[PDB]
Design a protein around this ligand. Structure first.
Ligand SMILES: O=C(O)c1ccc(Nc2nc(-c3ccc(Cl)cc3)cs2)cc1O
Length: 327
């Protein structure tokens, strides 16, 4: 069946230890070197704190991992090891445990994040190009390392808008890509789930992340965040189909032999494919260009195999102004 157009065999070409995360044995340092200063957030798998390393005064973030099999912990740790030094990937400083309870935690570099809801209403055209280019560097890097992030969304994209620093965080849903492998579709935030997930197509690849990135680009240039605002996973696909079109959805399903859950029959309706220019109005016109729309059109495609790769996206004319500034 389906495979990635890029980096398809890269894990098969590496040593097994690279991708056999169940066999990984982390070295767990001592969490007692860190003083927790403030809670930043919590989710189903972790709680995150700002902290200080008392031995060297470094400000960090500590992600204390909630009870889960050690398998998911080893996965995230091994992925982060493999991504060491990757451009715009959050830096893992250490893997530590409370030395009595043995509860594990991950220590990351600090980023002075600007809350994205505030940020995404004040970005300039050049800012959007710049930050999308920076995020693409992280995705091209992880994809080249054989890893799908599977949870790309604004929260997971820390941006320090003063220092112009971007980091892709929270690798707890990330997996290794292996050709023909069937993956769990219960990944990503609703609003950033690709159509493949919503139609229960398990043989997905790095291109899932490119759908999510496209959703972010749409939200930035159009100032509608999130761009596709489903009420549940079923409605999420309806929201997509009202833009990309229903006949076009059916062509995708037919190509990949995808079985459609019959609950969709009652809710998808009939929708023409919309022109991306339909989303332009006076509040967003200064962020939208022909180049932006061309790029977006090539990301927000049903057919995962037809989406741009991260590299192809980086190579698009939309980013020429950014490349020129960075050269
Ligand atoms: O899972 C992960 O790998 C993970 C990694 C890092 C991380 N860092 C965060 N930084 C903040 C923050 C917000 C506002 C200010 Cl002012 C400063 C920091 C929020 S979250 C969170 C993580 O969940």
């Amino acid at each position: 069946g389906s495979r990635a157009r890029v980096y398809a065999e890269v894990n098969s070409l590496r040593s097994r230890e690279y991708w056999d995360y169940e066999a990984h044995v982390p070295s767990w340092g001592n969490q007692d070197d860190y003083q927790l200063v403030r809670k930043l957030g919590r989710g189903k798998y972790s709680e995150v704190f700002e902290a200080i390393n008392i031995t060297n005064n470094e400000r960090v973030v500590v992600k204390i991992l909630k009870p889960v099999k050690k398998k998911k912990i080893k996965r995230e740790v091994k992925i982060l090891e493999n991504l060491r030094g990757g451009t715009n990937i959050i830096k893992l400083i250490d893997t530590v445990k409370d030395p009595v309870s043995k509860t594990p935690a991950l220590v990351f570099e600090y980023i002075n994040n600007t809350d994205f809801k505030q940020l995404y209403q004040i970005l300039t055209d050049f800012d959007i190009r710049f930050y999308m280019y920076e995020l693409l560097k992280a995705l091209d890097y992880c994809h080249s390392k054989g890893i799908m992030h599977r949870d790309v969304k604004p929260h997971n994209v820390m941006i320090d808008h003063q220092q112009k620093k971007l980091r892709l965080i929270d690798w707890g849903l990330a997996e290794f890509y292996h050709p023909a492998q069937e993956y769990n579709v219960r990944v990503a935030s609703r609003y950033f789930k690709g159509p493949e997930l919503l139609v229960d197509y398990q043989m997905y690849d790095y291109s899932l992340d490119m759908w999510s990135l496209g959703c972010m680009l749409a939200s930035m240039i159009f100032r509608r965040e999130p761009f596709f605002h489903g009420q549940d996973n079923y409605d999420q696909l309806v929201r997509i189909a009202k833009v990309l079109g229903t006949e076009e959805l059916y062509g995708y399903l037919k190509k990949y032999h995808i079985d459609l859950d019959p609950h969709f029959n009652d809710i998808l309706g009939q929708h023409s494919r919309k022109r991306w220019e339909n989303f332009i109005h006076s509040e967003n016109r200064h962020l939208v260009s022909p180049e932006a729309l061309d790029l977006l059109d090539k990301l927000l495609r049903y057919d995962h195999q037809q989406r741009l790769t991260a590299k192809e996206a980086m190579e698009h004319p939309y980013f020429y102004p950014v490349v020129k500034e960075q050269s």
